[PDB]
Design a protein around this ligand. Sequence first.
Ligand code: MET
Ligand code: NA
Ligand SMILES: [Zn+2]
Length: 434
Amino acid sequence: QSVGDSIFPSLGQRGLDVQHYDLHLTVPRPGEPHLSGDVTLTVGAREPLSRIVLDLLGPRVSAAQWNGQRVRWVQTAQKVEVTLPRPLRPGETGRLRLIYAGTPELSGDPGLPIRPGWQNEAGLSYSLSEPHGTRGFLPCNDHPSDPATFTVRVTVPASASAAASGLFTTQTERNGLKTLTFTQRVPVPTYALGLIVGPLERRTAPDVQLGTQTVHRRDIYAAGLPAGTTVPEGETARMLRVLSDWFGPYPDEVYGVALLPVRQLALETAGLTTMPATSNRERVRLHALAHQWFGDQVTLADWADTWLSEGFATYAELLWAESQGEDGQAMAADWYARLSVLPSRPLRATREEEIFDASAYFRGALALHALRLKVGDAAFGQFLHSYVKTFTGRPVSTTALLTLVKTQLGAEAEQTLRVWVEGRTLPPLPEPVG
Ligand code: MET
Ligand code: NA
Ligand SMILES: [Zn+2]
């Protein structure tokens, strides 16, 4: 019934394909968790579905409609189950509308770097929901194997502002309330949906030209940032050029950061990275930008394969470092020096405590380092382009990665990657052949 994730076995609905979220969120007091919601989901199906089963954790549904007609629905524990008048079959789409209100609940589970979900602190409310927190404020197929496009209308007090993933179009104001509209036009996972409300300011930068492609530039600056919380001029353009030369075209229409005066890890929310100031370093800004490809465009089929996101985002830091004239092998050796004193594991995680551990970041990066040094920078760069293309529109798996390596690069290259994928012991540091 559910997606059947190996880490979170109850999330999502098997065969459900949400294609667009049309969300109208109203945040009456930024900084406090209460909110109300009005969302219409455009859903398709990969198998016949008698019901639409959505994740929701906290708020209470008050009304539901299907294609504009009243429909039978029930809220059970962590799910909203909607019985359709007839099954939704592959090739068809329907519009499920849900009216809800209440307090999002955090899924803060010990073994995760955050309590994921709707965050509320210091006059700000914002989404920081990787892996399974979006269900706190949005009835959603809350699994990265079902990315979707988003249109978000955020209604906030006039004194406040709001920013969400997607290009900002309109802002209207009545009765002391402002409503802002953002359109995320390339599909991204539920947790990749950026949404921040509170005292914040929008700052545009000149367009970035990546050959034919134009990438808009916009950052968010919340009030009360520490001194020296900046995006160095020109850095994001150089990062976009260097990363897109490695991975292929940038997947989105805009990139920037939302700098927050809070103490938290950064999250690669689509086109607008949620960037607490304590994480605002060059290497994190690169990391989060790399994730726009590996995580937001190329999405995970199963939360056990987090290293496909975190390892690839981590290896981009070394590609960026080399691009800036630094020694890549020395950085790889630093990754290894930090893993040599830590427990190691195969790259496929089996427990939630492992999905964001040192192996997912650095053992995955060193896995890519072993592959790159085996096939050469030319072959490696052509494989990263192929990888992004092969898994655009299709969730990626560790198995699918190895098969693509054998396919494209050969059996020897596949076996080089596999020793890093499999095996509990940490392999020796990948070093140039010579
Ligand atoms: C605390 S969850 C954030 C994960 C994100 N991919 C990172 O680089 O830290
Ligand atoms: Na989808
Ligand atoms: Zn990351």
